[PDB]
Design a protein around this nucleic acid. Structure first.
Ligand SMILES: NC(=O)CC[C@H](N)C(=O)NS(=O)(=O)OC[C@H]1O[C@@H](n2cnc3c(N)ncnc32)[C@H](O)[C@@H]1O
Length: 529
RNA sequence: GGGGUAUCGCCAAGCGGUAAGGCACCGGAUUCUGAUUCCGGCAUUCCGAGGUUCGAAUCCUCGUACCCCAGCCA
């Protein structure tokens, strides 16, 4: 529960509302990130928990910054997280005629006028955080002039920035938002929904309070930065002819360590080509996390754990990872894969190989078992073999033994190096009947695999606070290794995850996984304390 | 100027009754994944200083730290 749900519990009792109607209003100017997910869970979640409704609305009031590819990807991420919206998808653009009419009502009430102060002059006239603003020389035009002038704007008779429609409120308000905020500005740009029918587009504050009201929204849930805007929201609805008046509630936005959480910065990583795309597995975007191996259920869990409050916060990466581990640890089938392979021959072994049985999930027999090929020439991880090694080292030591996962116990004996003195092959012997512990893969039946290890995109906890966050990108946020996996992964599918025993959770696709050379993304490593 | 928030390393309950939970962490027990699972520990303190009260983190007062607002962006 959170303060917002508590308010709603009250409202229901008193009877202010008998139904709750929320909305998720993203602007299609980029892809959604994990923060947007916190918002999606909140609005859609509250709706379903209270047998209510939640609209998916595209706040598409700025043509030049938006693209149809963004609206497309947003519907996708909302669906993927497991949420359904009310009726058809909505667009603010659906209300452009409506907004135009409401602007005309304000002008008629002398509550709005066409200003001709250039874009620079408006800031010069606006005042400062400590000094009040001053009325524009065009502030007292007659209703008739404003009316004619607005029509000229709409008709395209003014060059961009040469004119705008402003609300007539209070140039001396301590609330900068109330200093005659702009309602409309000129833009000769094609809109992804309205094409070229308009050359004037409504501003955010004007559009949003009216959109909510026409949609019957009961609880407009937004983030803390729109707190000051609150008085403009109510001003507009109080001054036009509209029957409902939605209530606002702000909660703090999500921040995750070692990453950025704004579309502007995420876009720069995309445009400057420092990540493959919005959906790069290293990105905090919904799509990137999906591609990374996270389950929607893991994300919904995360959002449930972090809560909804009014306090600034930065969650630690451990928390998000904990969520994905809790999921995959329970549902992901296990398999063998060697990321850093080194040949190990069993001079003692006789034949072309045999078959050994391995549980698909140890702690869960109900998940079944599989048949895995074993032989005398296998691959183990270079890190699991040491010639010396101290006491705690429970792996393979030149002279000691180690149990090969779900197989036989073997003893290291003769190693073999090359030029630089690197080991090329490890010879051992196996105990005919014997069935630390290391994983392995039979070299003859092994599937050549590309393994992509990922890590924090940035080297610092708060890359957003850097002068140049790009210069603080982590050069090892992605390292590609070529390894070997048990033949069983031959049928692996994109999306589905597996636990590479003693390594971590991995999954296919990665946009690169083909038929010949499979590519696996390490979703997250195993807890190694 | 105006608007917010300050409870254990990171999140977060508590709305006058004398400090939930999660993540992280530190111990021990299981375990053919040094995983998991499993028991145990972890703020006598709630930004600070006063005041009212039988009694406050929860009310009031003065402070202090931090966040947001001066786009014809959202
Ligand atoms: N009052 C409002 O709702 C304004 C919505 C505005 N068009 C907007 O913010 N669009 S947006 O596409 O940028 O984001 C859409 C919603 O996502 C929320 N949001 C954005 N970043 C968030 C974050 N880091 N954590 C939690 N929530 C976050 C916004 O509040 C908005 O409602």
């Amino acid at each position: 529960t959170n303060f917002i749900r508590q308010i709603i519990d009250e409202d229901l009792a008193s009877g202010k509302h008998t139904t709750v109607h929320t909305r998720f209003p993203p602007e299609p100017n980029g892809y959604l990130h994990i923060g947007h997910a916190k918002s999606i869970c909140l609005n859609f979640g509250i709706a379903q928990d209270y047998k209510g409704q939640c609209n998916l609305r595209f706040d598409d009031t700025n043509p030049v910054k938006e693209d149809i590819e963004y609206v497309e990807s947003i519907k996708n991420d909302v669906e993927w997280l497991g949420f359904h919206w009310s009726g058809n998808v909505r667009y603010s653009s659906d209300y452009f005629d409506q907004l135009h009419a409401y602007a005309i009502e304000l002008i008629n009430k002398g509550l709005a006028y066409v200003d001709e102060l250039t874009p620079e002059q408006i800031r010069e006239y606006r005042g400062t955080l400590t000094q009040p603003g001053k009325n524009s020389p065009y502030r007292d035009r007659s209703v008739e002039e404003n009316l004619a002038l607005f029509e000229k704007m709409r008709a395209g008779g003014f060059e961009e920035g040469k004119a705008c429609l402003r609300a007539k409120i209070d140039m001396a308000s301590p609330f900068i938002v109330m200093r005659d905020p702009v309602l409309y500005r000129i833009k000769f740009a094609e809109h992804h929904q309205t094409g070229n029918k308009w050359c004037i587009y409504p501003m955010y504050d004007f559009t949003h309070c009216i959109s909510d009201a026409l949609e019957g929204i009961t609880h407009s849930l937004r983030t803390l930065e729109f707190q000051d805007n609150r008085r403009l929201y109510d001003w507009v609805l109080d001054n036009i002819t509209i029957p409902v008046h939605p209530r606002q509630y702000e909660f703090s936005r999500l921040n995750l360590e070692y990453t950025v959480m704004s579309k502007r910065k995420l876009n720069l990583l995309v445009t400057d080509k420092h990540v493959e795309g919005w959906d790069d597995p290293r990105m905090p975007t919904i799509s990137g996390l999906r591609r990374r191996g996270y389950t929607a259920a893991s994300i919904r869990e995360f959002c449930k754990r972090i809560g909804v409050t009014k306090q600034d916060n930065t969650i630690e990466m451990a928390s998000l990872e904990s969520c994905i581990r809790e999921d995959l640890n329970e549902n992901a089938p296990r398999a063998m894969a060697v990321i850093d392979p080194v040949k190990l021959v069993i001079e003692n072994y006789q034949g072309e190989g045999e078959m050994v049985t391995m549980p698909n999930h140890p702690n869960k027999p109900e998940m079944g078992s599989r048949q895995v090929p074993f032989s005398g020439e296998i691959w183990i991880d270079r890190a699991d073999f040491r010639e010396e090694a101290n006491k705690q080292y429970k792996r393979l030591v030149l002279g000691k033994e180690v149990r090969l996962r779900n197989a036989y116990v073997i003893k290291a004996e003769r190693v073999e190096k090359d030029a630089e003195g690197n080991i090329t092959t490890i010879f051992c012997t196996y105990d005919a009947d014997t069935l630390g512990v290391i994983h392995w893969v039979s070299a003859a039946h092994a599937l050549p695999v590309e393994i992509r290890l990922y890590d924090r995109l940035f080297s610092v906890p708060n890359p957003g606070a850097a002068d140049d966050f790009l210069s603080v990108i982590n050069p090892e946020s992605l390292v590609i290794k070529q390894g070997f996996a048990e033949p069983s992964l031959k049928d692996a599918v994109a999306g589905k995850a597996f636990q590479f025993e003693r390594e971590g959770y991995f999954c296919l696709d990665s946009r690169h996984s083909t038929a010949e050379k499979p590519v696996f993304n390490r979703t997250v490593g195993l807890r190694d304390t």
